[PDB]
Scaffold this active site. Structure first.
Site, PDB file in Angstrom:
ATOM      1  CB  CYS B 151     -14.640   1.097 -22.188  1.00  0.00           C
ATOM      2  SG  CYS B 151     -13.741   2.150 -23.330  1.00  0.00           S
ATOM      3  CG  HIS B 178      -7.870   3.654 -25.348  1.00  0.00           C
ATOM      4  ND1 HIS B 178      -8.880   2.967 -26.114  1.00  0.00           N
ATOM      5  CD2 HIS B 178      -8.571   4.292 -24.276  1.00  0.00           C
ATOM      6  CE1 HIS B 178     -10.139   3.005 -25.650  1.00  0.00           C
ATOM      7  NE2 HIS B 178     -10.053   3.726 -24.472  1.00  0.00           N
ATOM      8  CG  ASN B 303     -10.823  -1.298 -25.141  1.00  0.00           C
ATOM      9  OD1 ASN B 303      -9.783  -1.507 -24.894  1.00  0.00           O
ATOM     10  ND2 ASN B 303     -11.238  -1.590 -26.509  1.00  0.00           N
TER      11      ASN B 303
END
Lengths: 325, 325, 325, 325
Positions: B151, B178, B303
């Site tokens: 991703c 993230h 993601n």
């Protein structure tokens, strides 16, 4: 003992009060705040970020008894009405924020205080100080309103100073990953990554003037309660390795920047730096170097505790120079 | 219609299934998963990140009825026991992760499947593909095991490709901020900023080989449920302004990278990109340029959703080239 | 000094170790854990919930030096291989959880330990103890494997005991609002309210047997890091007011349940009870009474720190009765 | 088509606007809000809780074009200056909250609107309505200012109505576990469980008058973004089992309370009820009965979406009775 008053009882005011009440070299004579003594004692004793206060906190008649010492309480919205002359206040810590800081400080001077420490940079203060960077610039005979800059600038400036004096800085960009303290900010709901502006790189001009135009950046507000991070990508003027950069920081932490900057080779997370008193802690395990010149450095800071400890350090520095010019 | 099976029913497997069941050009014949049909139907219908599924999801005897179509369910831990030859499976999406991906894929081939799409880069696949970057490299006569990268690589590679082809990239460092999906990772407790390694910059070699050695970075895991951010600080080979960089992205989004890369001039937060199907969305309001060459670019990506949409796009590309070599 | 070993170094094991290393009446001779000394020292020193450890923590050769004292480290998965006979271990704290607790405890006995404290109720222990409720039941000559119940039971049982002995309990239902420590639990993603089962009301049978059938409840897991809440709705056998209920708790906190149960008339939030050593803190401001008989009571507890302090209290109680039967 | 204006563009105003713009039986003529058209279009299109709006949202000159229809925009702080007479406004939805709601409503009447729907109970409205509970009480010839109660009351009242009409309610206490929307509230920092007061049980008097004195409760604010829970512990006047209680709810959901109350036998978490349009969803798997009479019932509700759907339902009910008295 230097006689201190604190104006404003937000998180910085309360943390500074907590730390100053432990300093036997400092006499906190009075507080000016918006709430009654019972509410103030509650806010001193309990804190969702730094835990319960260690000392006995007790509310009396328009006063507090903290750690055995009496602190007078006032509720004046106009600082020039305060009895600072009658209390012989040496230093007022102005902890109500950026808004009209210089006017408030002048109000405290008109009330009879000798010096004022602002908690924001670039308010037309007589001098801007970052402990470990330029505290030598304070002149007790010429400087009346003193700024302790901001929490992010107190993290960025020592890191950048080490880098510039050891290797020279060409230019750089930074991201400050900020805990919680513009349509984006208003639509938050405490759940998102939020890009915003930051003024720490510009405030760098006030304490390291030869470095402006060389650094700028932005902020990413993330939903963590406290502890923030400076992510600096800087080009240096000489070839380095990650180990050499980390060794420069390690040497500064044990000498010229002792108590201000620290260095960590441990695999910690942000929460492990809660209530850390340093202005910056280099994360040695993340330092990176691309093509010998482009350096990534990560610096942790408790955006509340480190700054408040610096405020108390500055009080002590100013008081020493007040008594021994 | 191309006949597809899905192996593994984690979040990527479920999102890919959701998207493929809406594609009338794709026939999802079967699923191999660790749970019973009732549990799978629950997991398809409900999702804490992307909300409830729009279509009717119903569990039958070792099958699902989704949007009116029957999907057979299997529970084989050894992929070579699967009846892919008997079902004429054209493509297996291997969605159990990085661990032994190539062995699993070969197992699916031994069971009779014609092609396998891996969901991880650098597993000795025959070819690594990022849609919008190098899908032209897929040869239906030579390539049997195909990787859709990761991703983060699907976000980084189109951005970097635009930058390199318009201005040339000297070198750069990145941080990927993230969402949630090493002592630091193990001590998380879902409350901290956690610096970790990332392999997206290295995986860039597989799809943009002329660019390795030029980019590297790290990850900052932050406690947001979904939607992540690439923070890229890159030096270019020619003078630019922020507006020129943003215009290059804006032009790529409407032409060569239509459907893969998008560009936003709106003040959004990360949550506003939840279930966004693009691989990357440039945040045009944060683009910065230092000394005409050092560029900061911020790229949002879901993601989960963007990657799964790319997986379905890749299925369609591979199937078209399978029927028309 | 009583000689203690700790088996398992999860959060309870580490908190118990932290507290026992401060007790000069207790000698922590050894630890059996799954990690090396360096990792264990890291986990002792740093904690995302309760902050950094106050004492010096240092890793040596298969040992730790903590607060100046040496602690031997072992890495045995089979407890009967441990050198407890050779170390004269008086008490083993079994802190690996509920799974096969009695088998593990017997293993420690076979290795030469004299007594074992389990950290879970209803494991066929010789006696189940809640400090402040029934510690008088421990017989040093008859009881070899002792349970300290659970954290929620250590909160619920003293509250319920005060209520039953002052007013008599007819019946009641409870909700335990639980911090983080079944398809619902598996689909969490750390973002939702999750209703689950609880066994604290059933575990009440072991320490207050005359009260079973009278209480049951459920849990609501909420995404807060630590500190939990018991929300008890109970019918009493005699007419009360909220003030009378609160006064019963206030009197128990200062006498019969001193150090175990506390009472608060302050407007606090859950985070203010982090690292509180009590088993339960009555929130006096929320106590409610409907029709003189139906009582709502809210009790805070740190589900980690209070329980670990009770474990150390139990070690001291057992050791005193071991030396003076 | 009934002509509607919306005053105030907080979260309820925006959700009501989103839902009403989809209703082809309703003509949203105008909005009165504090921001410009561009900001309003941004806030309509994007939402961190319920995701991006499906229809095309576009800002024009002091207007919006939404789903193809034009909506006029005004910026008046005094409602009696609004051109409601000139626009033939049938119903104004007053979505600025509790503060001075009746004065604002009268202002809208003085501006020429025919009816006003308040979004708060107990503001001396002519009638308080909960759809599914007492909407039959609305008299189009006598009632000019109408309240839709509150979100928590819209959850509690149908549940309590089913229970009272099937089994009779003796008395009960409740906890409402509330998402985010008093020293405790001020010290939040978005990280704690916070006990507060609630007025939903008292507001029950307005729609189910025979039931006051029988129910009261409190709120526990927990850090989840949206979706809340009513935890009701109620004594009934006749013997029941959990299955009988759940069957009463199941029958009401499919008949008398269709579209208002729903019943779930699925193991869901709170996030699965985001953007659920019902006023209440019984969690059938958690229903408990102690001694045949003391019943615990858990009811989910999106505290934003369900209430806004009820507001639109009420608009339609009022308009139907306005045209056909």
């Amino acid at each position: 003992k230097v006689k201190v008053a604190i104006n404003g009882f937000g998180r910085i005011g309360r943390m500074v009060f907590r730390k100053a009440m432990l300093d036997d070299q400092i006499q906190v004579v009075a507080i000016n705040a918006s709430y009654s003594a019972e509410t103030l004692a509650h806010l001193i004793k309990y804190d969702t970020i730094h835990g319960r206060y260690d000392k006995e906190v007790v509310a009396g008649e328009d006063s507090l008894i903290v750690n055995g010492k009496k602190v007078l309480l006032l509720n004046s919205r106009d600082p020039k009405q305060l009895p600072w002359r009658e209390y012989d206040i040496d230093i007022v810590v102005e902890a109500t924020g950026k808004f009209n800081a210089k006017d408030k400080a002048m109000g405290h001077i008109e009330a009879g205080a000798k010096k004022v420490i602002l908690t924001a940079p670039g308010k037309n203060e007589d001098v801007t100080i970052v402990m470990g960077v330029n505290e030598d610039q304070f002149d007790a005979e010429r400087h009346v309103i003193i700024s302790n800059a901001s929490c992010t600038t107190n993290c960025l400036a020592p890191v950048v100073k080490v880098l510039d004096e050891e290797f020279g800085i060409e230019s750089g960009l930074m991201t400050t990953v900020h805990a919680y303290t513009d349509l984006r900010r208003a639509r938050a709901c405490g759940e998102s990554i939020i890009p915003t502006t930051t003024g720490a790189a510009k405030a760098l001009s006030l304490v390291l003037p030869h470095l402006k135009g060389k650094l700028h950046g932005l902020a990413l507000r993330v939903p963590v309660p406290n502890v923030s991070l400076v992510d600096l990508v800087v080009d240096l003027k000489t070839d380095v390795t990650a180990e050499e950069v980390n060794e420069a920081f390690k040497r500064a932490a044990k000498t010229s920047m002792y108590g201000v900057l620290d260095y960590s080779d441990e695999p910690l997370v942000s929460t492990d730096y809660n209530t850390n008193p340093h202005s910056a802690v280099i994360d040695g395990l993340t330092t990176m170097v691309m093509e010998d010149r482009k350096v990534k450095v990560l610096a942790w800071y408790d955006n509340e505790w480190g700054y408040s400890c610096r405020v108390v350090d500055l009080i002590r520095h100013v008081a020493a120079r007040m008594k021994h010019p």
